[PDB]
Each structure stands twice: as structure tokens, then as C-alpha cells.
Amino acid sequence: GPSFPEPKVVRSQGGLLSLKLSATPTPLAIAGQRATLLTYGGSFPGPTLRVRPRDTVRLTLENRLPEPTNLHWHGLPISPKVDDPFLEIPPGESWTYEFTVPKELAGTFWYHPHLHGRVAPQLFAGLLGALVVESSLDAIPELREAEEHLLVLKDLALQGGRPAPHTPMDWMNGKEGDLVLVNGALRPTLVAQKATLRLRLLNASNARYYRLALQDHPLYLIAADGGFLEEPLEVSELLLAPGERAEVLVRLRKEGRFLLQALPYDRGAMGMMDMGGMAHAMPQGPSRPETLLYLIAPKNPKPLPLPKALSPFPTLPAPVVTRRLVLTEDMMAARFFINGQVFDHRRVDLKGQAQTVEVWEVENQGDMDHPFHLHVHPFQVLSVGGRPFPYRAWKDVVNLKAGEVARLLVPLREKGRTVFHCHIVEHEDRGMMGVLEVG
């Protein structure tokens, strides 16, 4: 096969992407070993769905797992009557998701389970895939002529040829695995054929962070979770928290081998120690550095010029309400809270009005990083930790370190009941989720 493994792509045909996908235990070869994972479409990751604005998507999910499941169309500003976080597909049953891709949309999105209390083990076991919305902006020469790849960043741990079970500490921290993979492959080699690469990045891990850095190179950020920036932004490194996506341009500067690494990052995960009358929580500290892939540059690379502009960010109406949502932790209980409460699917927490804009101030009063996700309604990050964001773009997950406040501008789009929650999915399963009703 191609030196660089990427998931199989399924494309819309004549404006329709009609596909049946089964969620199923699947024996497969992974990182040189045989394992049974839970997959969509018999692969890990699941197939990449590639569509254009205004396409119709008709996806029938057949549940062949021994427990109920469903889909979250992560990042898609569609109706919560379609992207329904409360729906349950029982074992053996099927459900058809049908929606139209919004006209003003572009970027890398993804799909995975969202059945409360069962997300972490299902996602950890392999149930996820990417969805790419192609844009007319892809036709500009500076992007068209780049070599494009999707990088699904997901780790895994195996025990007896199956995904390792969650421990109590896993429910507290979020589970990370020792196999740190790209597109389900262990440290693949990308042999570049062009000097400019356009990489779509997805963190589909339960809890692992990727502090991304390419040896000897900067990255040029061109898209965030849910759309393009206004112009490329040069960065020395790029942190991708669970659930986040980014698109970058890489401009290969000379021939050679360059490592794309996940540099040490301390997200505040905790261990336990006993030092002669202790038995108390201790920080795990920063992650060990990981090599994600080997990047081989072509001979005499001459990268393209960067595009001067991408997409202008919409001018939003003035906001009509300000909300405050405080995150707290009970680590030893592995319970997690928003405004002092745990999720209750019967309780509406916030009531907003469609087509108005709100300001959400999300404050992390815990000690762990928490990546805050809102369904259905993409937002503009204004500032985090009192620092203004250096670009305008649509996001749907925002990482908060301990103590930090994020100020978000949230246009309310589709009507209905939806949710917001931490995307360390163990924390969501353990209660860190709330309900927004838009009318």
C-alpha cells in the first residue's frame, strides 16, 4: 500500500452520500499485532466521509455491539433532532441519520458514539471516523497544489488482544494508551512528494493531548475545529486537545528526515502515592515525548507561497446574554461538575433564543485541563486565560488549563435540546455535561 496509511475515503455521489455502516467487534491487525476492536465499517479508524456544502448525507448505522450506541456528528451545525445526544440504538437495531450539509461550512469534522455513561469505553475501543467538508477555497492554487493528508491522532492500550479495560484511575483521569498511533498505524513514514503539505489533524483520543511540533519547521495554521482562519497563522507548535481539529500547511525547507512529535505536556493527570502515612493524590506530571510519524522531504523542496487570505470570518450581531459555567472536580470520587451539578438528561440548564448571540464565560476551577465542547452551535473563542485569541475561526472545543477562563461568542443556530460537556469523555460519562435548550 501507500507508505502513508490513511482511512479509506467515501465520497458523496451526485450530491448524495448514502451509506450503511455497522458498529461491530472486528478482528484486525494493528501496530503489528492481532486485536479485536470495535469499528465502524470494519476499519480503524472508520472510513473518512468526504462531502461538499448542500450535499445530502444518509447514513444508516447498524448496531452490532452488545450494548446500545448512537452517533454524534461532532462539529456539524445541524439540528439536534438529527445529531441527537439522547437517542439510543439498541443492540441489533439500526437508525438512519439524514441531514443536509450547511452551505457556509468547511473543514475537518468527525463522528463517534455519544450514549451517556458508555462513551469512553466505546470511543477507546475504536469507534470513530473523520468527515471532511470540501470547500471552493480548496481550488485556490496554494492549497490545490499542496499534498493533502488526514492525520487521525488516537492512542490505544491492548490487553489479551482487546482494548484494555478502564480502571478507576482511568475514570478519574481519562484513559491514555501506550500505543500512540496515527491513522491506526505505529509511527508511519510519510514520504512527501511535494514541498508543501496540507495536513488535516484530528485528536480522536479519549484524553491524550498532542503538543505538536515538527522538527526544524514551523506550522502554518489555516483552519480550526470548524472552519478556516482569515489568513494563515505561523506557529512553532500546536496543542490539540481531545476532540479538537486543525489544518496546517507545512513548508518543507530542505531534504532530510523530520520527526513530527507530541512534545511533553502536563494536562494535570493524577496518580496515587504512599510515602509512610500518605495514600494521597500526586501529579503524574508531563507526558513522555512521543514520535508520531517520520516525515521525509523530497529533493530540492521549493514550497508554494502561502495563500494571502483564506475565509473572512462573519461579523456577528451584538450578544444579548452572558453566561457563566464553572467546572469543578471531585477527583477521588471521579465526579465532575458544571455549576455544581452533574448531568441529568431531564434537566434543562440553559435556555437560549435561536439567531441571537450569547457570550459564554467558561471557567476551569479544577486542577486538570478540561476541553469544553458544545454541540450544534460553533463558537468564536475571544480569549482564554485573559489572553486574546490570535485568530478568528469557528471552534467547537476549547481547552482550559487549571484556573483559566475562556470567553466565547456563541451564535445560537438550530432549535432544540442539545448538550455541552468536557471532551475528556470519561469526565462526560462521569457527569461533566449539561443541557442547552434553544427555542
* Annotated binding residues for Cu(2+): 72, 74, 112, 114, 280, 370, 373, 375, 421-423, 427
Q: Which does 322 bind (CB under 5 to 8 A by kind): ligand [O-], Cu ion, its own copies, none?
A: its own copies
Q: What is the contact mask toward ligand [O-] in residues 56 to 75, using x (rule: CB under 6 A)?
A: ----------------x-x-
Q: Which residues pair with 99 in a beta bridge?
A: 57
Rounded CA-CA distance 296/190 in Å is 6
Does the protein bind its own copies through residue 309 (CB under 8 A)?
no
Q: How far is the CB of 285 from its own copies (least distance, A)?
A: 39
The residue assigned the cell 470519561 is 426
Q: Which of 296, 321, 331, 409 binds its own copies (CB under 8 A)?
A: 321
Contact between 127 and Cu ion by CB under 5 A: the answer reads no
Nearer to ligand [O-], 112 or 407 (CB): 112
430 binds, among Cu ion, ligand [O-], its own copies, none (CB under 5 to 8 A by kind): none
Per DSSP, what are the bridge partners of residue 259? 294
Q: Strands 350-352, 433-438: parallel, antiparallel or unpaired by DSSP?
A: parallel
- Smallest separation (angstroms) from ligand [O-] to the CB of 72: 5
> Considering beta carbons, is residue 198 or 370 the nearer one to Cu ion?
370
C-alpha span between 248 and 389 (Å, rounded): 17
Which lies closer to Cu ion via its Cβ, residue 201 or residue 422? 422
Count of residues touching Cu ion (by CB under 5 A) = 8
Could you tell me how many residues of this chain bind its own copies (CB under 8 A)?
3
Q: Alpha-carbon distance 63 to 81, whole Å?
A: 19
How far apart are CB 420 and ligand [O-] at their closest, in Å?
10
Q: Does 118 bind ligand [O-] (CB under 6 A)?
A: no
State which residue, 30 or 357, has the beta carbon closest to its own copies: 357
Residue 343 contacts residue 116 (beta carbons within 8 Å): yes
Which triple of cell numbers denotes residue 389?
Answer: 485569541
* Minimum CB distance to its own copies smaller for 350 or for 402: 350
Distance CA 242, CA 203 (A): 5
Q: From the list Cu ion, its own copies, ligand [O-], none, which binds 198 (C-beta under 5 to 8 Å, kind-based)?
A: none
Q: Which of 8, 14, 243 is nearest to 110 (CA)?
A: 243
To the nearest whole angstrom, how small is the minimum distance from the Cβ of residue 114 to Cu ion?
A: 5
Cβ neighbour number for residue 387 with a 10 Å cutoff: 8
Kindly state whether residue 355 participates in binding its own copies, applying the rule CB under 8 A. no
Of 118, 106, 110, the residue nearest 40 (C-alpha): 110
300 Rama class: left (phi>0) / alpha (psi -120 to 50) / beta? left
Contact of residue 251 among ligand [O-], Cu ion, its own copies, none (CB under 5-8 Å per partner type): none
Q: Which range of residues in 49-57, 304-312, 320-328, 428-436 is near its own copies by CB under 8 A?
A: 320-328
Q: Please confirm whether the linkage preceding 378 is cis (ω < 30° from 0).
A: no
Q: Is 370 in the site for Cu ion (CB under 5 A)?
A: yes
- DSSP track, 207-258: S--EEEEETTB-EEEEEETTEEEEEEEEES-EEE-TT-EEEEEEE--SSEEE
Q: Binding-site residue total for ligand [O-] (CB under 6 A)?
A: 3
Which residue in the set 16, 278, 309, 320 belongs to the binding site for its own copies (CB under 8 A)? 320
Q: How far is CA 225 from CA 78, 197, 245, in A?
A: 15, 19, 4
Q: What is the smallest separation between the CB atom of 155 and Cu ion, expressed in angstroms?
A: 16
- For ligand [O-], the closer CB: 200 or 421: 421
Q: Which of 74, 208, 395, 417 touches Cu ion by CB under 5 A? A: 74
> Quick check: 179 and 185 in contact, CB under 8 A?
no
Q: How many CA atoms lie within 13 A of 282 on its CB side?
A: 9
Q: Decide: 264 and 325 in contact? Cβ < 8 Å.
A: no
Interface with its own copies (CB under 8 A): 320-322
Interface with ligand [O-] (CB under 6 A): 72, 74, 114
